Symmetry: T
Subunit: 151 residues, 12 copies
């Protein structure tokens, strides 16, 4: 996809690439939490986590395709993703409160990156900014549904 302004494409890649890596990692780590969660709220949190993962897969895809449509590649191979990301999700079985605290922590780091994209794209490309804004609304809502459980 060409195109007209290499500066617009370069800004989208710069601000949206970290969003892709963190959303795609949240699919893999969210799956881990969903399989390994235990305790009194299992079925609800098991299912809430699968929701979060479905959302994160869709956000990863939207952000990535926005980049590619502007004519730049994205490297989101597993090795790259793992170099660029970190998770607090436990290695094995864990009580639901603890999986929520871990997922909320990964969500918090994605939000830092989404907010950086919103500010960064504001004077360069409002169309790519809108992608980060839409992702941010969905993630802020997921974060509330997770965290409401701990209050």
């Amino acid at each position: 996809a060409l195109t007209a302004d290499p500066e617009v494409a370069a800004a989208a890649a710069q601000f949206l690439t970290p969003v892709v890596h963190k959303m795609q990692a949240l699919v893999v780590n969210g799956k881990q939490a969903h399989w390994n969660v235990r305790g009194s709220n299992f079925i609800a949190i098991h299912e809430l986590l699968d929701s979060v993962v479905a959302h994160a897969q869709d956000y990863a895809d939207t952000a990535a395709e926005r980049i590619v449509a502007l004519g730049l590649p994205i490297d989101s191979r597993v090795s790259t993703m793992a170099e660029k990301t970190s998770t607090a999700v436990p290695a094995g079985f864990a009580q639901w409160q603890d999986e929520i605290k871990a997922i909320v922590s990964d969500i918090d780091a994605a939000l830092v990156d989404l907010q950086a994209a919103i500010d960064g794209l504001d004077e360069v490309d409002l169309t790519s900014q809108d992608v980060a804004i839409e992702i941010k609304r969905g993630v802020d809502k997921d974060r509330w549904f997770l965290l409401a459980h701990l209050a």
Copy 2:
């Protein structure tokens, strides 16, 4: 209940979870970055490879957990245990297919070991491995038939 039955099954199935889950991530990579004369049909087919891979990853991982054992499928553990030929950047559809087929071949090696090895251990977990192997053998053919020429 024999805990070595569950542990042995987890040992056969864990590589399948790691490889299927990496196939989801690396297939998305190929789905985003593919170019060339067959773009739309391959971009769509890779997405359906990915959706199958995610299901197979879920089926295998929840067999392990149903057997009572945890599964370490964190991003960090997955990268340590898997490797991909999917290119880093834009690539022609033939090259994307070849690389996804190579990742699949390595998954089929672990599925065949799981099928052989579960035969003496746990037939219900064997069946999970056969079911994933049927589906994966079919994706492999859909991909490879494009290069037959």
Copy 3:
């Protein structure tokens, strides 16, 4: 037919029909009577268990009938052949879960014996028992996961 092939399946699949269909009735009982902080999630979870049990009971019974033998699964015969831990009246969700898992664990013994017993005799009926065991093992995990810690 081979007269033994049919007789082996009635013998191994019959107790699965009886326990699966008893699990529909006692599942409903738990579903109606369950109380406490997790009511809505467990009320629905149990409904899902009942729906699976009903499907599994049909699949096993219809496999037996397809091979040409009758099945006696009247209320009276089922009560003779089955037992339940589900309480008579209101009970906290933890206790409903333990009671149903107990009932499942008994079904699992009969499924595993059908899997072992069908192995050199009728692989088509063995597949029925395997397919039912997979779903029952998963329903047991969803129930049991609630009681960890």
Copy 4:
């Protein structure tokens, strides 16, 4: 008082037992039915079973919503119900007569629930009236086959 909750359980409890028993004995007929009408009757019996399970759930939960438990364990249900459904294979005409006989007994309980709840609780009465409309229709779909 609610002696009003107690009346629901008295009049609706029989309904839960007979409907729930109809799910099991209905499935028995469905599996074991034979002969020239197999597929229409096998299907129709599966439809009667689905209805029965719904009615059992509606009656039971009406009782629980009022505050009283229900004992519908397999043992209690067997003690309080009887079936004419044959132990094994049987012609479609015989399965019908057996099932209609099981329906006729439930209908007796539903009518006693309608009459009994009339001066006590119209909301529970309405549950038994709803179930009786469905069970009356099921009985006709079955029995019209033998009309002949």
Copy 5:
């Protein structure tokens, strides 16, 4: 017509409209502000209670309008005729359940009054109240079972 039939419908169903419509708004209040260990299940359950209450308000109101009489359920009038135990802000789920159960109990008084009052007047409008009462009694149990023991 006989104008006393429409008049008794409006007299006994109007409070059902006001309290069902109020339960939609105050239900949404509790749905948004609910907090604690059971959040997702209770947040969803309350949304279902709100959807039922909206349907019930509609059914009762259209029965009145179909008999030829108007209904005043503007916000101002509905606020004069109803009150709520739902808190102004964030609250634990046990407290939201108790507040909403309180509101349901007042609507139940009015439903039973309609059922009794419409019995020698209009059995078609009586049936509308009976249908709403069946749904509200079930909703009430779903909420209240979470608090039991």
Copy 6:
């Protein structure tokens, strides 16, 4: 982590949106039930869709507030203090129902436009919620109003 000031300022802009939208649900139903006249079925139906949109908008705005970590007071008593309606008490011709609901919508549009201008310097994510609500509300207003054009 994240500026409580931003959240607090955003809740202030969105809170009137929630009260006005939730009131349009109740007032719109009022109009839906009591509307009369030659256009009854079309307008009775349009009002139902207006009510269903309004309820979604109330839910999106309120959920945005709570996602920012703040409570929302939308009890009936509070909503009645902060809102008023032109919808008649009883039976009304469809022309009069449209003019009343348009007047209620117009007042919502004032709060919406204030959210949009004010959130531009506070939170663009919250501002997008208000923009999405105003696009739908604007459209609903035209569908109502086009009827009176002649």
Copy 7:
């Protein structure tokens, strides 16, 4: 052979259903035919809204005829709703050709009014006799009362 289960299990309750629901079936079934006539022939400024609203009134009337008829038959007595009988037992204000939508509405409401009289008589006559059949009449009266309002509201005020 045989003979066995009775087909008409309660002949007095059967007879009450047939006595009170038969007129319901004939008028509901007639409403389907005459509703379609109005649906086809309606003209004027409200054409499309009215054309469609008449189509739902027709679909309701068909389902109510079916519910009423199958209640009678389930209880064990036949129903004669052949075209010749329904025509003897029913009449319509619906015009023979094209008619403006207000006049179609008035005609349909007049046919619904005659149906409502039969439904109220059924609700009253089944009251001490068969509450299950009564419930069928109540359910139909609720939906017919609502369709009457939808039609009639158009002519207010």
Copy 8:
């Protein structure tokens, strides 16, 4: 007016007979008895839903061309007759009675196809489509008596 007139001449009998078939097929559906009850009760409902569609299609064809249709119950009854029994009947007899009503409708359908042929091929297509469906329905019914 010529095409409108031809449409009215040929499709009007189709409307009357299809709408009658709805009412008389409903009668057969309620009152059918016998070893084949469920399959025939359900098959008769499907014939009734087709007949209602066919009436609606033929009727709107006439009206779209500018002529009214009188399909009130009194007019339909004056123009149609049925062999459907007044009460309970065995399914073999409901099928013979319904196939009789259908044979009558087929004669009017074929007349409409022959008569619209020099006049209006678009109205003629309505008659053909109805006939295809009604021939199929007649076969589903009649196959049951083939032995």
Copy 9:
């Protein structure tokens, strides 16, 4: 014989142009219609547009299926068609009359196709017949509103 394809192209091409034009001009009437019947007519015109797009597709694909190109570019379509749809806001009665006038012109061409394909290609003729059935019905749905 290449003259089957040529006849279809000859009789179906004006049908594609007028149906495609009706999508655009009907969208125009859809956006700009005002007055007491707004929502009903705004919806009805969307439905006319959806049908017209389908008719255009069916006719054009019949031509291409027979082996011949179709020139339905905007520029060509505009040379070949005219509309009475007003430039701006108009009352619903006026939108209906202007769309009925564009439909009447489409009917002249459909009828010429039906007559012209009669001795040549009954399969292409069936395409014209099917489109004409649907457009005759649309015209009535519009016009009935003005009967009074």
Copy 10:
């Protein structure tokens, strides 16, 4: 190394299954069109369901052989050479169509059991394919034959 015997065995054991399932589609359609008598609608529909299942089993078996890298010859001419039907050439009573279809099914079950036996030692993934087809076909058989238990 890779192993060709796994593929050749699948083709050996699954190919009769493809041809017999595919011929059942065509002969089952024949019985479906030409069936007559007291049970016509129920049998006519039943047979359509058996044909839908048979088409699925053919596809499943074929694509298994293809996925393993080997071609399948299932042209009409080849299929006709390798298969045979008891279905009558013209109209037949439903009891006779049922007997003819059950006979075609019985022959296909012989090949499925040979495939299940033959694949046990060689390729359990393909064996599974045959087991799944056999469960469906065994059940189709019963639904048909139950009508003759009379």
Copy 11:
């Protein structure tokens, strides 16, 4: 009382169409399973759609014959005597699968046109069946052949 000529003409002109469409299901599946090369997935899928359409057309044309009171013989053995295919025995490139399929479709179209012309004086209802099948087959043929336009 029914004209024996109407039935006989429909059997005469529609029976070849049933044989050719039913064969196209079988040979189309063969092409679907065995196709290869750069357009695999798009043609694999396009062939399944042509197979489904061919099955629907087979059904429609056969049911028209039986509705008129005549049986039809579409057993595998008869269908094979009466049809032939160019679809290859094994793996083939997608260009050659398209060409083969088009060739089978061209043979069906000559029979469709013969039905349309021959039913014109006898039975317009049966001619309509042939007309409808021909519109769909002419479209399938275009979708296949346009790939070879380069």
Copy 12:
């Protein structure tokens, strides 16, 4: 402020015209496309067409909802619009290139709308941004085919 509605009409009007023209020229390309990618490109063009028709409706109804008419008659649309889509049969690479060219022109107008609405009306700006996001994506799906 009627300067708002006037801004939306100024900036959104070229969007309505070029999207609506893309429907007609997109159908032309979809009908006439040929070559080794026929079915995938035939289907992709139908999807671009369906998006374009929705983008046109969204932009036009934004203008109308603000209280201004829109002239999108065929004749006005043709005056304001140009296509590079060939008159007849063309290879899929040429149709892609022609359509992409038509999409590039729409994107200039979309960008002018985004930039021009920024200080006037953020609600109409958002319409243009949403349209631009979908149009950028469709352009990529088309153009990725030509990367070799």
